[PDB]
Design a protein around this ligand. Structure first.
Ligand SMILES: O=c1ccn([C@@H]2O[C@H](COP(=O)(O)OP(=O)(O)O)[C@@H](O)[C@H]2O)c(=O)[nH]1
Ligand SMILES: [Cl-]
Length: 401
């Protein structure tokens, strides 16, 4: 048994990094290790309450509580850094973060996980290079991602000066963001009779690669005309969101305090929720006929990692509807074959044949027995692919190598 310190130096954002950090903590504790979850409070975020953590998470102001921060990070055997300060923090924040890295006990094994994809996101970081150089173990979502192919080669140039050193780049291991899929099912799974087959619920946030435009399109072309309802949760307001109205796309927007105002009846525009509490969404999703996760990252960013919203759909008992090309570009953890090559119960949304996609949805909607068989397959498939029991063990073995 060891002491683990999970550190989110960017702060607790409430999305995938936070989710990963919490699932990571759960796995370590479940496996007999001691864990402290620490996050920089210097920068605040909108979804800090999306996940349950307040009863154990340890906030620290890097710019003003360096001593506190240092004592925390040096009180472990393994330090896991899941995020670094954002480009908008004050000098004291980033300066003290860099000082932390330099003063971490040399004997402590520092593990760095790069949870983001595009360079756009990656460059919005401060001190990532210094973090990578101190790391004893580095993880990324793809061998061909921007982190591996752009930043790493930039920090470790394949062409040195003259009086410097060649310094080979450190090894970067692939990883999948795990979730205790069994735990979610044991808490939210509903009997098929409790599910409203006419509800189509998309979950994510306002970033175009999450595929929200495709959901609006699918609602307009097939779901709305068929008398079905569409709900989209997690779309925060921002310049990207403003583009929706500018394009003339109809929708009704709500906050949690007005969720009871959502019109879930036929012939309505997409109903949008600005932000969601994870547990509340899982409850709503478990009673929804079909869940949608239409992320469409470029192939370079895809290896084996599905996202948490992908896993949540299968885990809570709805029928998962995923972006076809993503399934084609991802490989099954078990045998390394495309996710689409399996009879998984997952409906692979095809933008080039949405008619076929909706036909399958109507088929499952009309036969509760079939519906049940299909989601049991999806649950098992996703469990085999990315449950914490498998993935965190794989990562633990790599970390302790
Ligand atoms: O308003 C929101 C938006 C997202 N999430 C959760 O935050 C995580 C997001 O991780 P994912 O890997 O799906 O994508 P990311 O946000 O990290 O790119 C998932 O557990 C979502 O259910 C949430 O609880 N509330
Ligand atoms: Cl996050």
């Amino acid at each position: 048994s060891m002491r683990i310190c999970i550190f989110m130096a960017r702060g607790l954002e409430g999305c995938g990094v936070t989710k990963f950090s919490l699932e990571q903590r759960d796995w370590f504790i479940k496996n007999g290790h001691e864990v402290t979850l620490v996050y920089a409070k210097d920068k605040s975020f909108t979804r800090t309450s999306s996940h349950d953590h307040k009863s154990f998470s340890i906030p620290v102001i890097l710019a003003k509580e360096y001593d506190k921060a240092l004592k925390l990070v040096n009180d472990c055997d393994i330090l896991i850094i899941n995020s670094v300060p954002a480009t908008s923090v004050q000098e004291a924040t980033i300066n003290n973060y860099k000082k932390l890295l330099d003063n971490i006990k040399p004997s402590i094994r520092v593990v760095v996980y790069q949870h983001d994809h595009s360079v756009l996101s990656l460059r919005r970081n401060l001190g990532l290079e210094e973090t990578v150089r101190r790391a004893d173990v580095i993880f990324s979502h793809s061998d061909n991602g921007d982190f591996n192919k752009v930043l790493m080669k930039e920090w470790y140039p394949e062409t040195v000066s003259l009086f410097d050193d060649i310094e080979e780049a450190p090894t970067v291991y692939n990883f999948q963001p795990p979730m205790d899929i069994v735990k979610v099912r044991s808490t939210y799974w509903k009997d098929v009779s409790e599910i409203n087959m006419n509800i189509n619920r998309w979950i994510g946030r306002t970033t175009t690669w999450k595929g929200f435009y495709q959901m609006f399109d699918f609602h307009e072309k097939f779901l709305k005309p068929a008398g079905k309802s569409t709900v989209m949760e997690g779309l925060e307001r921002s310049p990207a969101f403003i583009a929706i109205k500018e394009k003339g796309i109809p929708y009704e927007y709500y906050g949690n305090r007005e969720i009871d105002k959502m019109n879930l009846a036929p012939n309505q525009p997409a109903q949008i929720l600005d932000c969601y509490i994870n547990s509340e969404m899982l409850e709503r999703m478990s009673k929804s006929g079909f869940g949608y996760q239409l992320s469409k990252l470029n192939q370079k960013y895809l290896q084996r990692s599905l996202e948490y919203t992908h896993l949540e759909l299968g885990a809570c008992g709805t029928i998962p509807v995923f972006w076809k090309s993503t399934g084609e570009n991802l490989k099954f953890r078990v045998d390394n074959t495309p996710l689409t090559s399996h009879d998984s119960g997952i409906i692979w949304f095809d933008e080039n044949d949405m008619e076929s996609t909706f036909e399958r949805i109507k088929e499952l909607s009309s036969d509760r027995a079939l519906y049940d068989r299909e989601r049991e397959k999806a649950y098992e498939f996703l469990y085999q692919h990315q449950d914490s029991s498998f993935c965190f063990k794989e990562q633990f073995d790599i970390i302790t190598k």
